[PDB]
Amino acid sequence: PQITLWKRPLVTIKIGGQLKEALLDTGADNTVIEEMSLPGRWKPKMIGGIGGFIKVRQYDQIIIEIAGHKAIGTVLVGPTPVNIIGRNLLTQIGATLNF
Amino acid sequence: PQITLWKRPLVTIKIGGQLKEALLDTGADNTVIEEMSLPGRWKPKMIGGIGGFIKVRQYDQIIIEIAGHKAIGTVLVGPTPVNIIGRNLLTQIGATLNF
Numbered sequence: 423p424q425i426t427l428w429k430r431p432l433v434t435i436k437i438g439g440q441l442k443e444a445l446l447d448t449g450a451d452n453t454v455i456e457e458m459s460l461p462g463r464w465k466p467k468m469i470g471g472i473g474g475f476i477k478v479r480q481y482d483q484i485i486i487e488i489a490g491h492k493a494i495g496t497v498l499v500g501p502t503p504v505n506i507i508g509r510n511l512l513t514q515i516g517a518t519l520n521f
Numbered sequence: 522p523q524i525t526l527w528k529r530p531l532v533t534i535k536i537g538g539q540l541k542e543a544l545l546d547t548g549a550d551n552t553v554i555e556e557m558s559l560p561g562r563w564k565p566k567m568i569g570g571i572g573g574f575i576k577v578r579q580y581d582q583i584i585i586e587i588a589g590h591k592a593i594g595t596v597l598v599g600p601t602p603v604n605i606i607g608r609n610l611l612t613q614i615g616a617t618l619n620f
């Protein structure tokens with residue numbers, strides 16, 4: 423679909439068997455999902471942005487369906503304010519910025 | 522143009538007559554530029570990101586050229602790790618997310 427930017431570009435995603443609301447963020451290199459008890463092997467990571475850093479658990483090869491579109495890659499789980507779909511997955515669903 | 526996301530969506534901008542590199546950020550409500558001297562009146566404001574809240578100078582009705590496209594709006598100046606063009610200006614240049 424085509425998403426206008428008058429409001430935050432939020433779409434429904436599915437991860438770990440749960441449906442969530444997520445923000446399509448062209449300014450995020452990574453995908454960060456709110457704290458959830460996702461099973462699997464992980465490694466500690468620190469991610470930054472405006473305001474500083476937050477500690478997250480990095481999960482490799484996690485499948486997430488984004489607005490009906492399947493993707494698979496690295497997902498960071500931690501105390502993020504909103505669910506963020508970054509470029510690592512955006513490229514997988516064929517998302518582009520157009521103007 | 523159509524911008525894919527394999528690489529960060531960086532563009533050249535012109536603000537205060539000075540050229541800079543900025544990231545087209547669909548996940549940012551506002552446009553936040555690194556500390557710089559900008560002609561005009563400003564008011565103290567606080568914004569939040571992934572790592573926390575930071576203090577910024579809010580400049581209203583600023584003329585800024587984004588990748589050759591002109592926009593005139595709110596620009597926040599502060600300690601941001603990267604110059605970001607948020608939705609307030611992305612809508613002005615007619616940017617949409619597509620997939």
Ligand SMILES: CCCC[C@H](NC(=O)[C@H](C)NC(=O)[C@H](CCC(=O)O)NC(=O)[C@H](Cc1ccccc1)NC[C@H](CC(C)C)NC(=O)[C@@H](NC(=O)[C@@H](N)CCCNC(N)=[NH2+])C(C)C)C(N)=O
Binds near residue numbers: 449469503544552566
């Ligand atoms: C005028 C005031 C308006 C009101 C004001 N509004 C805000 O604070 C709103 C919610 N903030 C935002 O929309 C801010 C951007 C700042 C802004 O627009 O003001 N957005 C953001 O901060 C969004 C995530 C988010 C979205 C909504 C809510 C909370 C967080 N992240 C944008 C950000 C861009 C980056 C280049 C700086 N990306 C990231 O932080 C991602 N990080 C990365 O991709 C890193 N790997 C590399 C970038 C950082 N580099 C570095 N540290 N050397 C992260 C999500 C994995 C308020 N106080 O509520």
